[model samples]
Target: RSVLGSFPQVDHHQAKGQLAEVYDDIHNTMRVPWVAFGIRVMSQFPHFIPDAWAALKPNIETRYAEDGADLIRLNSIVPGPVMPNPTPKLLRLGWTESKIEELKTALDLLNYGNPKYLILITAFNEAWHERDTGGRAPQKLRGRDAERIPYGLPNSVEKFNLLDIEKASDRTQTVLRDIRDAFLHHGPASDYRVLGVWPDYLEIALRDSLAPVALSAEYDETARRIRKIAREHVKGFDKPAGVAWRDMTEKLSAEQIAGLTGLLFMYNRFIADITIAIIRLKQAFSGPEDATANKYTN
Candidate 1:
């Protein structure tokens, strides 16, 4: 029998000390030649593992493309009345245009296939931004009432309350700030207690702000599934690699694994979309032209 099966500890703290003893026993008393032998033996056959690379590649590309698109939308067309908006125009320009050019240049230098089509599309994005910055409106709370009003309910019921909307918006902003800090600083452990505020706020904002448009039963189900995954997997200590490995081996049916992987990818993509949208909106309000210039155009 393996020594791990014999260990009494079930919890992580106790398991740590017990693990050292097991390692010593295997190395010294059992006189195992090498730890890698067991792994090497197990790897001889192909395993029906989740195609993590295949699943994750589209997510990465989606995020990159969406971010680029958002940059163009926010900087050029989203009614920003400012020069040098706070939403990192330079980075957006770099991502949407210069980066693609640089990639193609490098590929050409190496005599690889040049993706000229992509370069043209990226250039168009930059050009669109340049055109959109002129004659944009001063940012104000023009759509706040429309954004606040809940749908499928009577207008007389006062679904759109300005005070409540303001409060919710403030709380959502606070949660967003925390999320940004957590992402940027990377200091706090990604515990649910620590990391849950952002998603929770997001759910609330969607329910409140998006109710005016439409609310889907499917969206609610998807949110519930995502919440379960986050609560189970993402909310704890660097989750045990063994837990993931065993989940892949035992708990997950093939279809369920694929579904969960897809859900996770969408969750990540949605976060990026919402974050960029918020940044763009705020930048429109706080741009240099909005802050410094008079009502009359120069």
Candidate 2:
């Protein structure tokens, strides 16, 4: 049985019921490209989903995102080994101009989605852990930066297939499982799915960009440190107040518990890893960092 209602994820295209309400509110209120998997699974609970969301909506907005989120998001990345520039390979493969634009279009979506998901996932994890979010908005050196998350979620090109791992090519499936196992997730990410338009492209990403850094011991330590940063900034959730997931075991089946746990585990690592990758890529693309990392901050 699929607990937390995640066996078949509710597609943004096909969302209905309360799930639809949450999607619409998030879309209308916050500009994130996709819903967090945690939100999708929490749809299994009544009053819980909306009640939680009602509180979270303002939390992310007033709490702030993008720039400040990037700080907490990348604080733990430190420095590490990385692929110099994945873009050069695109030119090497002879995908020029228009095709390159298409690839950027895909990457642009993931880059935006990952950080915002960081904010949302933090909301859930902190609440579920019964941790205090410290009733204050996210701030910068200058002052508080309150920006609407953003609008317009990306519509992936029709050509991209969200790979069904059970049916993916052996290589793709194996890499997906290995990547998830390395970081401790239920499965590969939707960001990975968006990157799946070109099989070889995704293969390279998994084998090179992702594996070398995201699967290493240093990455593990960096991820753990960043998660703490994220947790500290989380505050003011209204659902399951002052209680932990372990307390709900009787009400939630083991499968449901695992489903929720997996959702958090998957995204927490994903958002942290992607934030560092984005910053590093920017460093490679330009002479230095600030321009990219401080876009909203400045």
Candidate 3:
């Protein structure tokens, strides 16, 4: 189950009918290995994801949209004192080099997807509020930068199993819940779920690295910086990428709209922080060059 406090969402595996189709389309369209937490939460509202995605689909496929996600990825690292690398400790604990590589691969998946989802959710939130999402001169991208990314899962990437929350031990559950509480998040992000697959890594990284800077001013600033970059970059698109709340009145009640509004707003911040959190975790094992760069594209 994909828990988000008291809120409801359709997990990718649990989705049925149109929601199932939408989940798959999101993966293929975004070229991501997994359906993002924000999109799943957005599915809670009637007719929202289908309508919102229809508007976003065209815009997100463009070179400009990819560039925007790249910028967010580049700038998402939280500026602060560096955390100690965990690789040595993992090795000492009997983890093999191949096992460490597998862990890095999982981190790479989240590192690749989080910023793009950040951009997607920001576009949705900005447009839902009727903010300026488009209608401006296009930003220039020379040479191959103008090309659209391939529209399926990248061949080099592998999907990892997300940790099942119910089966987790109390210590693991406490750590995950602490993370959620730190950000006042509705629930843990998909990044956390993927990281949770390696319980030792998750616990150590969060306790040492993430917890220290989780809500520090510098960390919050990085999230806001990414959010601001996304908001500004969306203006470069040829058209807005979200459905306005006013347009959805016929399909939803006032209370539902209210719930959806808060959810989107919350996710915009949550995703931004998660983007930075995952990258920061990667940096603990590797260098910023590997952590912050666009992993999928390069």
Candidate 4:
């Protein structure tokens, strides 16, 4: 578990050819800010990534994703948004009304997409581990057996470059630090830095929304529920003919693989729980309808 794999951890953009195209597909379609680290680490086994993604893509693309999201929502009891709403704070500071709107818009996109990909990445990890579980496989659960809900947000949310923490202004340097501080394990995800599209909104969200929530007891509790939800959704599977972790040797000690996989698993849960909290926070800003209903598809 202490050893490393053949491929160095890399950004999806660093991949070439078909793998690069797949990363683009994952972002444009799944709506995640960055590919999960487990996926990149699996690049050590070439066919592993493609095959695992192929198996998971169908469920991730449609209502099946929403079913999983709905289950976790019902199962997990998370905290509400940070109070003294940022809108009033920004207004008192003489900030414009539209800045608050931008904050909501940014969070709306992130809040919507994070859980969907949480389920996506968790299932993909499970698939690669050689299993699929009950209660999660869409093929077995009928409409009556599953609770379907609207989980995806409109793609209208504006996009921005992930702020390079060092090159970004000092204000965002604080933003980077505080965002990372909110996480129990992983650093601030690209999604958080992308919020740098509006530095002012970024500052307010960090101070008012994220920083406080990071302190709440429910934040960690909900993360545990997310992990349980993930386990329910994934199970062991029979290995396919062409699929196996190839050429391991000194490339990776079994201990390193376990550590990396466990790291990604924790990260997936953290992102989901935090995003769900952000979605609830956005609701406090936008109202109940925004938090509970789907604008487009499930």
Candidate 5:
């Protein structure tokens, strides 16, 4: 008889209670004994490395916590974060066959610190390119439309007269064209072709030209002031207080340890502030709409 078929049907409340019992049975009968055996094995290894301990500690704690919990739910878990799914069908095709072998090579190569995995990615790129150019598949642009229909490049080049602009402007256009072509023909590579001049253009156009000068100066001053306040407040606490609580797990009292943990959580508040400051700075100096303005106005 099938194991599930042998089981009796129950109401919702009874089903929930039965599931709780099953969870507890699995935790006690399997997980606890396995963890004890694993810890004993690790304890026997005198030459075991601290780095390995550091890496495994989080996972070990997570597993133990999961066994203790009635239901496991992570704050990071969200259902279908992307609408219409971010992965294309072409990207998914042959993925399992390709990636399984690639991962084996990667695992073997990791100890040697070699870049065979990157080469595997390049092979996948070539496969995609072949599929695209062979007319067997369509190219997707920004997850919106398939590039099967004829669509000419925007004539932004014609809007700005080459003869009227300075020599620097002409050089900029040349660099932009090279970048455009690189993105159009072959996708980005870590090689010099993709790296060259593009970042310089972005820096010059956005940071130098677009950013609001006055706003940048204001934020710079604010950042300095906030940092000064942090230093001062940190100093206000006793010197030994900082060092005593450095490793609260080993040293601090329960109350002091709780305070240290609170500080750790509060550290994200400053991170939020820093992010807002950057957004404000960027908003002040973002590129004018004229850069993307349609030249063919009625």
Candidate 6:
């Protein structure tokens, strides 16, 4: 086990009451199949997730928000040597067409959800730091651009299922754990667990595709690039969004504020990395064009 700093978080299965409500809203509002790891971690900070999410929910559902995510998605593919398509390999390894299609659906789920969360977190990070999140931007979201994105999961995308890590084989546990370690993540993002459904694919992806470039200069640059895109995009919102950290100074202690600040900052980078990583994983199977295209738009 890679022993790192402690980062406690509520898993989705363990959330309850208001926390559970927030998790559900995150799914329905974001139209994602599952709550992301960052939101679950934010839930630990007492008033933070509830208040911040309440402020964020309205802003993130618009077409401008979707476009921000789309921009992030298009720019997330990291520079790398060309990867051969994995379809033939999956077939040779006994994955039937139907099963492969299921895998594509799984990838599509993350490919759809991750970038949206990237926009959400980026907006949150900026607000927490007292960066201007809205109201002053000259450009306005007009007509269809100002409209709300369709709510609820698309009919074609089913609820996502994750492998139970505790009961998983030693190798499965190792691959998932290593990913957390590689990313300095508190836990594997929902993306990893969903990908964990196919341990062979996860292992090959981690070793052959991700390992060589996991923290390379180009990888980090891609993360920074999307972070910038999200930051700039949030400026275009017509109204101010997110719960500014200053607003919580009275409710939260100094120590708690310090922790929340660092935690939010870390997850911003983690989500950016996963946003790119998962899309790159999809690229391996389906090619760049399919991997980057919006899969859940209404």
Candidate 4, lDDT over the whole model:
0.55
- Show where candidate 3 strays beyond 4 Å: 1-7, 136-147
Predicted candidate 6 versus true structure: per-residue lDDT over 71-119, tens digit per residue: 9988988887667666777889999999988888888789889999988
The predictions' CA RMSDs to the true structure, in order, are: 24.2, 5.5, 2.5, 6.1, 27.7, 2.2
List the pairs of residues colliding in candidate 5.
Answer: 210-285, 211-285, 212-285
**For each candidate, what is the lDDT?**
0.25, 0.54, 0.80, 0.55, 0.24, 0.81
Relative to the true structure, candidate 3 reaches a TM of 0.92
Model 3 clashing residue pairs (backbone): none
Best of the two (1, 2) by lDDT: 2
Q: 107-195 in candidate 5: lDDT tens per residue?
A: 12121111111111111122222211112223212221211211121222111111211223434444433433322312111111112
Question: What stretches of model 5 exceed 4 Å from their correct place?
Answer: 1-64, 68-76, 79-82, 85-96, 100-263, 266-298
TM-score-based ranking, best first? Answer: 6, 3, 4, 2, 1, 5
* Model 6, runs deviating above 4 Å: 1-7
CA lDDT, candidate 2, residue 30: 47
lDDT of 4 at 257: 55
lDDT of 1 by residue, 203-292 (tens): 332333222222234333433333333222211111111113223545556664454444333333333222222332223335423222
TM-score of each: 0.21, 0.72, 0.92, 0.72, 0.17, 0.93
Q: Which candidate gets the maximum TM-score versus the true structure?
A: 6
Weakest lDDT window of 10 consecutive positions for candidate 2:
235-244
lDDT for each residue of candidate 3 in 26-65, tens digit (9 for 90 to 100): 7877778788888887897788888888888777777778
Model 2 clashing residue pairs (backbone): 31-150, 133-234, 133-235
